[PDB]
Design an enzyme around this catalytic site. Structure first.
Site, PDB file in Angstrom:
ATOM      1  N   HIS A 172       0.844  -1.233   0.000  1.00  0.00           N
ATOM      2  CA  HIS A 172       0.000   0.000   0.000  1.00  0.00           C
ATOM      3  C   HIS A 172       0.868   1.268   0.000  1.00  0.00           C
ATOM      4  O   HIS A 172       0.420   2.284  -0.566  1.00  0.00           O
ATOM      5  CB  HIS A 172      -0.953  -0.011   1.214  1.00  0.00           C
ATOM      6  CG  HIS A 172      -1.996   1.060   1.237  1.00  0.00           C
ATOM      7  ND1 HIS A 172      -3.325   0.776   1.492  1.00  0.00           N
ATOM      8  CD2 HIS A 172      -1.928   2.401   1.068  1.00  0.00           C
ATOM      9  CE1 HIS A 172      -4.027   1.891   1.470  1.00  0.00           C
ATOM     10  NE2 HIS A 172      -3.194   2.904   1.210  1.00  0.00           N
ATOM     11  N   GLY A 184      -2.987   6.342   8.681  1.00  0.00           N
ATOM     12  CA  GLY A 184      -1.585   6.401   9.116  1.00  0.00           C
ATOM     13  C   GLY A 184      -1.203   5.188   9.957  1.00  0.00           C
ATOM     14  O   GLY A 184       0.006   5.017  10.191  1.00  0.00           O
ATOM     15  N   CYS A 242      -1.611   2.000   9.204  1.00  0.00           N
ATOM     16  CA  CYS A 242      -1.122   0.958   8.257  1.00  0.00           C
ATOM     17  C   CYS A 242       0.294   0.525   8.672  1.00  0.00           C
ATOM     18  O   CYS A 242       1.116   1.412   8.954  1.00  0.00           O
ATOM     19  CB  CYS A 242      -1.132   1.497   6.827  1.00  0.00           C
ATOM     20  SG  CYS A 242      -1.336   0.245   5.530  1.00  0.00           S
TER      21      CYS A 242
HETATM   22  C1  U0P Z   1      -9.180   4.436   9.019  1.00  0.00           C
HETATM   23  C2  U0P Z   1      -8.181   3.290   8.858  1.00  0.00           C
HETATM   24  C3  U0P Z   1      -7.038   3.318   8.107  1.00  0.00           C
HETATM   25  C4  U0P Z   1      -6.424   2.074   8.238  1.00  0.00           C
HETATM   26  C5  U0P Z   1      -5.104   1.650   7.558  1.00  0.00           C
HETATM   27  N1  U0P Z   1      -4.942   2.454   6.334  1.00  0.00           N
HETATM   28  C6  U0P Z   1      -5.675   2.072   5.120  1.00  0.00           C
HETATM   29  C7  U0P Z   1      -4.079   3.637   6.325  1.00  0.00           C
HETATM   30  O1  U0P Z   1      -3.490   3.934   7.317  1.00  0.00           O
HETATM   31  N2  U0P Z   1      -3.943   4.441   5.100  1.00  0.00           N
HETATM   32  C8  U0P Z   1      -3.076   5.627   5.074  1.00  0.00           C
HETATM   33  C9  U0P Z   1      -1.575   5.351   5.194  1.00  0.00           C
HETATM   34  C10 U0P Z   1      -2.178   5.748   3.840  1.00  0.00           C
HETATM   35  N3  U0P Z   1      -7.197   1.326   9.038  1.00  0.00           N
HETATM   36  O2  U0P Z   1      -8.258   2.090   9.413  1.00  0.00           O
END
Ligand code: U0P
Ligand code: U0P
Lengths: 304, 304
Positions: B41, B143, B145
């Protein structure tokens, strides 16, 4: 999204835990700079605990009677003193992992993390509240004495609790890091009964705000109330009175959601009077009171 | 006494968290030896996430496009590869805080701790279960992730989860540390609906044992059952089928309490059919399923 009972990351505190042994009693100590803090209990036999005279028991103890082990290395004790219900053991080595820290005495309803330890070794971390009756509902077995409770503000650990004892009802009592018990409890194995464990109303409201932010909205109703009307209902349900100071503290959550605090109070009033009818809020079938307004903002905003 | 939803002490994992940035996307990485593991990602815009071709997006990326920061110090990326849904960034420095570790792929019903991180910085720790539908019910904001889930066996961290994404229902999906999603989920912003979130029966039983050990006994009844009879009731209530393997795993808790597993099943059957009638078990108004039998033994025995 999602809302969890979340503890502070424990690393900074893990770096401070040591084993303290006096004769046959082993428990945990907190090593900050060149001082190890531990419950004065360290000097009692279980026999002693029925009616201990700590000043008299301490005359029989020298520096060399306090065995302090940090990992599998012994620290040299060069001094000891009793402050209220804690001992301060001066060691000849500053803890090299000492974080920035403060000692704070929290109010009832304040939450904190506990790092449960045995023999100076961390076993787990969990989130607690100082109950309105100055107990905490912990998870502590024999040997857990000296485990600490803390908050972290960025890089500064605020130590607020040290675990001393279990009441016959299996709730917990301890001290701040100056050795002062929360509430009326004493470090003696005697009749100590807790008062009413009331619900921390401002925390329930904070958690209802967390529920709305996370999409759990079924309990939002068409009513409002006043502080005086809400408080009549609170008193009946053994909830703490809500003050204008609590309303002020919930202001940012009110703003973020657009639900007036008194509207959320009216939702809470209906939940108290009607129950959950077998529904859940953030995976709970009861109203959670161990999140502060500050906790909800922190977890909903991702503070590190 | 007392029984808490307890996470592992997070220090060993805190020492492994870094920030990974690729173009405008920042998330968390796990630094073990000279490898940083992060969700693939990291290379997508939110536009990309609607239908990403990761192999094609990765051709456009060099080592120098992956910015890895450990505290406020930059790590040099000397290699990168995609393994399933994770990137492995080879750095020129072994993490000096690398704990003993393993990568394990857990089964549904297994519990673990999550260290929620933002910009490589730990924000909190909480305890999760792999749900029977291979989601987890986390607390994760944008964030988060690359935040990881783990168990600790004494001094060895078993990493079992890395956080990738949130389903439209606000439940969470991620991978093991080989980059394989738990369940049928993909790292694409599309229609992904979770299956039935069934209750982890063996975990509920473990927690009922924890309740008995901690003095909550009101739900113990005069009945027994059989696996087949219990399972008819389990199925009706969207509980996972109980197997003889689960009965075997509950053997030590059976032994400690002297309550036969099938007797506890009969207590659980009555709780399902009758409800809690406004009572609580270990401070819960619902049957908790995010403690394994191993968790209950650990917390009830004080393992470090
Ligand atoms: C709300 C939520 C977000 C997530 C994890 N994710 C997809 C992210 O952090 N995306 C950001 C880093 C580019 N899980 O719940
Ligand atoms: C059970 C239980 C015990 C405690 C704390 N305590 C009194 C001890 O650890 N005592 C042992 C160290 C000499 N809290 O709950």
């Amino acid at each position: 999204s999602g809302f969890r009972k979340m503890a502070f990351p424990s690393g900074k505190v893990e770096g401070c835990m040591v084993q303290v042994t006096c004769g046959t009693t082993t428990l945990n100590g907190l090593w900050l700079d060149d001082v190890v803090y531990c419950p004065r209990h360290v000097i009692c036999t279980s026999e002693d605990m029925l009616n201990p005279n700590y000043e008299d028991l301490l005359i029989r103890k020298s520096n060399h009677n306090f065995l302090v082990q940090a990992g599998n290395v012994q620290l040299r004790v060069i001094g000891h003193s009793m402050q209220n219900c804690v001992l301060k053991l001066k060691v000849d080595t500053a803890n090299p992992k000492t974080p920035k820290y403060k000692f704070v005495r929290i109010q009832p309803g304040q939450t904190f993390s506990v790092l449960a330890c045995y023999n100076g070794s961390p076993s787990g971390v969990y989130q607690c509240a100082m109950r309105p009756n100055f107990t905490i509902k912990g998870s502590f077995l024999n040997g857990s004495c000296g485990s600490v409770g803390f908050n972290i503000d960025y890089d500064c650990v605020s130590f607020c609790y040290m675990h001393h004892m279990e009441l016959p009802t299996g709730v917990h009592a301890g001290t701040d890091l100056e050795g002062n018990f929360y509430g009326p409890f004493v470090d003696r194995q005697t009749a100590q009964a807790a008062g009413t464990d009331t619900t921390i109303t401002v925390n329930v409201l904070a958690w209802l705000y967390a529920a709305v932010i996370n999409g759990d909205r079924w309990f939002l109703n068409r009513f409002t109330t006043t502080l005086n009307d809400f408080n009549l209902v609170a008193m009946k349900y053994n909830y703490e009175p809500l003050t204008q100071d609590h309303v002020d503290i919930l202001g940012p959550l009110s703003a973020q959601t657009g639900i007036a605090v008194l509207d959320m109070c009216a939702s809470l009033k209906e939940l108290l009077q009607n129950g959950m009818n077998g529904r859940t809020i953030l995976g709970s079938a009861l109203l959670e009171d161990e999140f502060t307004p500050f906790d909800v903002v922190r977890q909903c905003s991702g503070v590190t």
